[PDB]
Amino acid sequence: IVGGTASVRGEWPWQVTLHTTSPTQRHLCGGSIIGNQWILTAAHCFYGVESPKILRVYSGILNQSEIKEDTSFFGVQEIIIHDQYKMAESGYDIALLKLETTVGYGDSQRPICLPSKGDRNVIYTDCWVTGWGYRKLRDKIQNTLQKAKIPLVTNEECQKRYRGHKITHKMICAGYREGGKDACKGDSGGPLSCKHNEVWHLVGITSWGEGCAQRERPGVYTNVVEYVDWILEKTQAV
Ligand SMILES: COC(=O)Nc1ccc(-c2[nH]c([C@H](Cc3ccccc3)NC(=O)CCc3cc(Cl)ccc3-n3cnnn3)nc2Cl)cc1
Numbered sequence: 524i525v526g527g528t529a530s531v532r533g534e535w536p537w538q539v540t541l542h543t544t545s546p547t548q549r550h551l552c553g554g555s556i557i558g559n560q561w562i563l564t565a566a567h568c569f570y571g572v573e574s575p576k577i578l579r580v581y582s583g584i585l586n587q588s589e590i591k592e593d594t595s596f597f598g599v600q601e602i603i604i605h606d607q608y609k610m611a612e613s614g615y616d617i618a619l620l621k622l623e624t625t626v627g628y629g630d631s632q633r634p635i636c637l638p639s640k641g642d643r644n645v646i647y648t649d650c651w652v653t654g655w656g657y658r659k660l661r662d663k664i665q666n667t668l669q670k671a672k673i674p675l676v677t678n679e680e681c682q683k684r685y686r687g688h689k690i691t692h693k694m695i696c697a698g699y700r701e702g703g704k705d706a707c708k709g710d711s712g713g714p715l716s717c718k719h720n721e722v723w724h725l726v727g728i729t730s731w732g733e734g735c736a737q738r739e740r741p742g743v744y745t746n747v748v749e750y751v752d753w754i755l756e757k758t759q760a761v
Pocket of ligand 1: 549550551552567568569570656663664705706707708709710711712729730731732733734735736741742743744
């Protein structure tokens with residue numbers, strides 16, 4: 524996160540850190556708890572990931588230093604990538620992790636509500652991007668989960684900012700015209716959380732951008748509302 528500040532423990536209890544074990548253990552991507560055995564994240568995070576056996580999901584984490592070999596985690600039973608996904612820049616940048624065991628909800632780990640189909644017409648004015656990602660293009664993973672409040676940008680305005688790309692309605696953009704606050708390397712797959720009527724909703728999934736927090740380059744997010752039926756298809760399978 525560029526231009527963000529330290530989160531307070533328990534502030535974003537749906538935020539997870541997805542680690543890879545191969546070749547060595549490290550943070551890979553962000554994710555959000557959406558159900559007791561479900562993590563919603565970005566499809567691009569799994570480039571070259573050949574098995575869910577190398578993945579570890581850590582919930583209830585503020586600082587990466589809380590993670591040692593004796594720290595409990597959730598194993599991943601299955602990686603579900605949207606079957607239309609080719610690359611982040613073309614959309615369908617969404618994946619589900621089905622956990623081997625059930626998350627016990629509490630003040631440190633709980634789910635974020637998915638947006639409602641009716642909420643496609645609501646205007647979100649209180650949106651935040653969170654993660655352990657870089658504070659600039661050449662940096663390192665941060666110990667403390669960072670947060671940054673970012674304004675949502677219309678599809679028309681985002682398309683003007685990305686000439687040569689096709690910004691679809693399955694993407695949602697966020698950023699200040701002057702830059703300064705955005706997601707960066709290591710934040711992808713994490714949430715873009717918006718508060719509306721005292722309830723937080725998972726509005727976006729950190730996906731892609733041209734550099735980090737650059738002037739007139741909003742961050743591009745998977746527009747979660749456009750995938751509610753796909754999420755329910757995969758999570759509510761009979
Ligand atoms: C010790 O552990 C580590 O150092 N772990 C570590 C884990 C992941 C990364 C990392 N993550 C990303 C991954 C893409 C990816 C995933 C998984 C594997 C490989 C690539 N991108 C991101 O997190 C941010 C993409 C992005 C979104 C938005 Cl909304 C706005 C701007 C951008 N950026 C553009 N240019 N940079 N950031 N790029 C890098 Cl580099 C870097 C370091």
